[PDB]
Design a protein around this ligand. Structure first.
Ligand SMILES: CC(C)CN(C[C@@H](O)[C@H](Cc1ccccc1)NC(=O)O[C@H]1CO[C@H]2OCC[C@H]21)S(=O)(=O)c1ccc([C@H](C)O)cc1
Lengths: 99, 99
C-alpha cells in the first residue's frame, strides 16, 4: 500500500502469534518492540536515542508479519514507549520512501 | 525519488545558509537538529525519545531545503544524537512509504 505521513505510520503486525501496533520507522536501523516474554536465547544490549539509552534483549531470527508481508530478522525487546519496525525488517517487506 | 532502506536514508539539507546531513525519520513526529545557531526568536520546549525527555529550542517557520524540495516549518534544536527530519517536514515535500 501507500502510507502518508499526516499521522504516525502505525500498522498492525503479528509477532510470535500476537497482534500489535508498530511504527514503520526509517530512522531506526533495527526493530525494537515493547516488553514481551519471547522464548529462546537472547543477549543483552544497550540502544540509544533522544533522551539517552535503554536496556533491551536481542533475539535473532524472529518472524513478524507486517500487513500480510512476512519478515524474519533481529528483534530487540525492552521498555520502549512504542513498537518500532526498523530498516532491518522494512527492507524485507519491500518498503521504500518516495517523494 | 525512490529510496530503499538497506542503508540509512541520509540526505543533505540546507538550513540557515548552511548544508548539513540529516536522517529521514518517519518515526519522528518532529524535526530535531543537533546544536547549531539559527536566526529568529525561539521558545524552550520538551520532547521525548526512546530514552527520555530533553530540552530543546523551538524555531518556528524555518526554511529548510531537502534534496531540492523547500519546506517551511518548525525546527527543534537540541542534544539529539542525529539530525532527524520528522513528519512535520516530510509531509511538506510529499514523502510517503510504499510496499
Ligand atoms: C532518533 C533516531 C536517530 C533513532 N530513533 C528512531 C526514531 O524514529 C524515534 C522512534 C520513536 C522513539 C520513542 C517514541 C516515538 C518514536 N523517533 C523520535 O525520537 O522522534 C522524536 C522527534 O519527534 C517526536 O516524535 C516521537 C518522538 C520524538 S530511536 O527510537 O531512538 C532508535 C535507536 C536505535 C535502534 C536500533 C538499536 O537500531 C532503533 C530505534
Amino acid at each position: 500500500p501507500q502510507i502518508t505521513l499526516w499521522k504516525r505510520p502505525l500498522v498492525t503486525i503479528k509477532i510470535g502469534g500476537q497482534l500489535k501496533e508498530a511504527l514503520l520507522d526509517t530512522g531506526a536501523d533495527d526493530t525494537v518492540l515493547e516488553e514481551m516474554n519471547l522464548p529462546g536465547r537472547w543477549k543483552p544490549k544497550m540502544i540509544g536515542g533522544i533522551g539517552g539509552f535503554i536496556k533491551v534483549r536481542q533475539y535473532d531470527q524472529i518472524l513478524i508479519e507486517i500487513c500480510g508481508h512476512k519478515a524474519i530478522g533481529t528483534v530487540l525487546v525492552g521498555p520502549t514507549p512504542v513498537n518500532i519496525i526498523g530498516r532491518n525488517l522494512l527492507t524485507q517487506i519491500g518498503c521504500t520512501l518516495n517523494f
